[PDB]
């Protein structure tokens, strides 16, 4: 789970 939406996820 990330606080932000990540481009490479």
């Amino acid at each position, epitope marked *: *789970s*990330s*606080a*932000v*939406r*990540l*481009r*490479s996820s």
Partner: antibody
Amino acid sequence: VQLVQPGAEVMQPGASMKVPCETSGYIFNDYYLHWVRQAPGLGLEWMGWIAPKTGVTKFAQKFQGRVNMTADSSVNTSYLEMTGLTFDDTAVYFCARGTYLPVDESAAFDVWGLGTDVTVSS
Amino acid sequence: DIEMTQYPDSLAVFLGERATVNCKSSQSVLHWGNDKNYFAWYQQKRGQAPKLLISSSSARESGVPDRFSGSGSGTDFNLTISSLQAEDVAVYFCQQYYEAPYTFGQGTRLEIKT
């Protein structure tokens, strides 16, 4: 801070194209580049991105297997390659700057190339 | 894919009056992690590249005049011009950058006259 693209390219049906995007005024490796195309009088279509530092890419499913995106940091340029051109590929190809890679948060496209007008025609 | 649809296709407004464009996404672009909408609006004039106006639903870019504002959350967004100026005639596009593919809709804005 800008992205430089050539005005126009004319290619033949069935041929390959290679559209460049030369970065200015910032560090080439630190941002994602995106390609967005616009057929005459129509919408914007997102094609894919490239993280120039690592060459890692992601393409929209409909362009998978006919596109590539590559980077040459020695000339601060990144390239869109597409094969099997048809009349439906006639469009303006814009490159645009998104996400700052060290932080990697998905970002809107703040800086755009003027676009390369690509005409597929014999 | 997240499908974006703008309403209306075409908008006519008298100079000095309020113009509003709607966008709907087929899925929410609101991230639980930071409570941010990964939603932008772009202006495109005839023969030019798109220009980013608004990111995060409502954050104006540097130099975008404050007659432009954005609103909405999740799946439903508006771009509002409080007072239409001549320089604002353009096509306006929404975009989600929540997940790839990073999709656009399309919206045409003109001056209304007799």
